């Protein structure tokens, strides 16, 4: 993975040694090249994963997440140019350095072959994320958002550190390839009940699991646009990715420990989807939609079936491009009216005709219109949960109805109707804004032509 780690590190000298007026151009161009070379990870086999060395390996699960992660860095740089224009040059270059550090930690996180190495990198993503929220957020609440995002993750991650170190002392290794062959069943005892909680609580808080999600509406809303994009597109998927790996060494105890979390997620789906029906803040409505979409991922991972795993991987990638697109669309309005209230600016389809087309496509993907990969992932998770218990179709069905109501309510409330009379600074959409949306939705739809590359190892 040194062919990707080293070029990412070299994005830092490039930013710092570039001309003052070329920092965005240089960093954007070379981050798109690193994204281009990420396609070489697609050299996957039907039996064995890519095992590069003693430290890093890539399989069909980490590869789509790696490609998504490296694709978002250029998009984050585009989305941040406007609101950082009136910023000190050194502080503009420190903002980019935090984004590059976040990618550096993420690419090493998804390919780490040893669980403790995964833990350190999984935990190191907090520092740059915390700094982006608290330093370059706009409102007062960014300080409290950072504290919630920080202490929710460490309250669950620290017990995971003890559990991992305990596993190495008893099994002898934490290399993920070794665990595939040396794994042993988990006898049902009170000691193993808490090894299960310690091995899964960190990932569920980061998903997030309903009830432990209170950090997400704060952090995802108060962060700058680049922070929100990475927060919702790649950093929620560290929890899902971890559970996919860690669940290998928790059988059979997962078949009864999963009930309290399958119940929280299934019922959390309906609660979080319902909250969106009454959200006054547009950016907050999008934040709660992630909680409802990651509820399906938790359920799929916990019921442990080939179809649920295939759906989970497609959902994480599909949700990554859609939620990220929605935040950029919402930030497009904010940069004109400088308010997050959804009902402030209305009828925007009569003033920004083309940006209303992106709203439509971003809304259709969010409500899982077939055959988008959003529907493929969601459908695969409904099929698997039906076999688990036929009654689940009721809860899955109700969430689909609510999802369409708050997806189109957002579209109707902000785009249709009469325009607000006293808002007269709605300038025509920039080429930067339009190209930012096209870089979200076009890959999201092209994947429908070749879905297999995002269906995960179980394919």
């Amino acid at each position: 993975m040194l062919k990707y780690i080293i070029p990412t590190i070299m994005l830092m000298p490039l930013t710092w040694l570039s001309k003052n007026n070329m920092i965005w151009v240089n960093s954007t161009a070379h981050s798109l090249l690193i994204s281009f070379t990420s396609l070489l990870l697609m050299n996957q086999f039907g039996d064995n994963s890519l095992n590069f060395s003693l430290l890093f390996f890539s399989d069909s699960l980490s590869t789509p997440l790696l490609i998504l992660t490296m694709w978002l860095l250029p998009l984050m740089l585009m989305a941040s140019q406007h609101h950082l224009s009136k910023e000190n040059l050194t502080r503009k270059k420190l903002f980019i350095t935090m984004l590059i550090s976040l990618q550096l930690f993420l690419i090493m996180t998804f390919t780490a072959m040893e669980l403790i190495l995964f833990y350190i990198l999984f935990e190191a993503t907090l520092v740059p994320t915390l700094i982006i929220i608290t330093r370059w957020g706009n409102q007062t609440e960014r300080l409290n958002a950072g504290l919630y995002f920080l202490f929710y993750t460490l309250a669950g991650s620290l017990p995971l550190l003890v559990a991992l170190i305990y596993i190495q002392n008893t099994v002898g290794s934490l290399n993920f390839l070794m665990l595939q062959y040396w794994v042993q069943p988990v006898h049902n005892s009170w000691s193993n009940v808490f090894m299960w909680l310690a091995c899964m609580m960190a990932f569920m808080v980061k998903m997030p699991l309903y009830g432990l999600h209170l950090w997400l509406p704060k952090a995802h809303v108060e962060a700058p646009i680049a922070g929100s994009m990475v927060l919702a597109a790649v950093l929620l998927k560290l929890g899902g990715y971890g559970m996919l790996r860690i669940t290998l060494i928790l059988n059979p105890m997962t078949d009864f420990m999963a009930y309290p979390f399958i119940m929280l997620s299934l019922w959390g789906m309906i609660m979080t989807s319902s909250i969106c029906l009454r959200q006054t803040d547009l950016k907050s409505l999008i934040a709660y939609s992630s909680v409802s979409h990651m509820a399906l991922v938790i359920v799929a991972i916990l019921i442990q079936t080939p179809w649920s795993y295939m759906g989970a991987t497609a959902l994480m990638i599909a949700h990554g491009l859609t939620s990220s697109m929605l935040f950029c669309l919402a930030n497009s309005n904010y940069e004109r009216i400088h308010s997050r209230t959804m009902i402030l600016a209305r009828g925007l389809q009569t003033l920004l005709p083309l940006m209303a087309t992106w709203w439509l496509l971003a809304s259709l993907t969010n409500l899982a219109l077939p055959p988008t990969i959003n529907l493929i992932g969601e459908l695969f998770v409904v099929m698997s949960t039906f076999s688990w218990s036929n009654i689940t179709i009721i809860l899955m069905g109700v969430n689909m109805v609510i999802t369409a109501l708050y997806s189109l309510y957002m579209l109707i409330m902000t785009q249709r109707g009469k325009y607000t009379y006293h808002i007269n600074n709605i300038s025509p959409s920039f080429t930067r804004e339009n190209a930012l949306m096209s870089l979200h939705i076009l890959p999201l739809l092209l994947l429908t032509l070749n879905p297999k590359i995002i269906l995960g190892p179980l394919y």
Binding site: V25, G46, R432
Partner: protein, 99 residues
């Protein structure tokens, strides 16, 4: 006042000083080149060549080979009267049951 603080600066319309602005930068020369790198590397290289690269992957995860192999086995097994698929994955001649 409660302190000496600058007034909230009014937002700047990028189209006022540059009606050809692409939105990337205030300098027109920098603005144009930022638009060119995003469109060439974003759309001409990554989305067009990346899509073409993916379309011609060398049998991603060996699913064409699997179909080709299964055709031989179905042909071979049927030509010899063997079951199309056995219900035991491992030959029970080398399995020792508990008791």
């Amino acid at each position: 006042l409660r302190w000496q603080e600058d007034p909230e600066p009014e937002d700047e319309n990028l189209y006022e000083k540059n009606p050809d602005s692409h939105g990337y930068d205030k300098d027109p020369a920098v603005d144009i080149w930022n638009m060119r790198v995003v469109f060439f590397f974003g759309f001409s290289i990554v989305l067009v060549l990346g899509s073409t690269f993916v379309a011609y992957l060398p049998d991603y995860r060996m699913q064409e080979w699997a179909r080709r192999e299964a055709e031989r086995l179905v042909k071979y097994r049927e030509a010899h009267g063997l079951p199309i698929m056995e219900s035991n994955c491992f030959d029970p001649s080398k399995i020792q049951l508990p008791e």
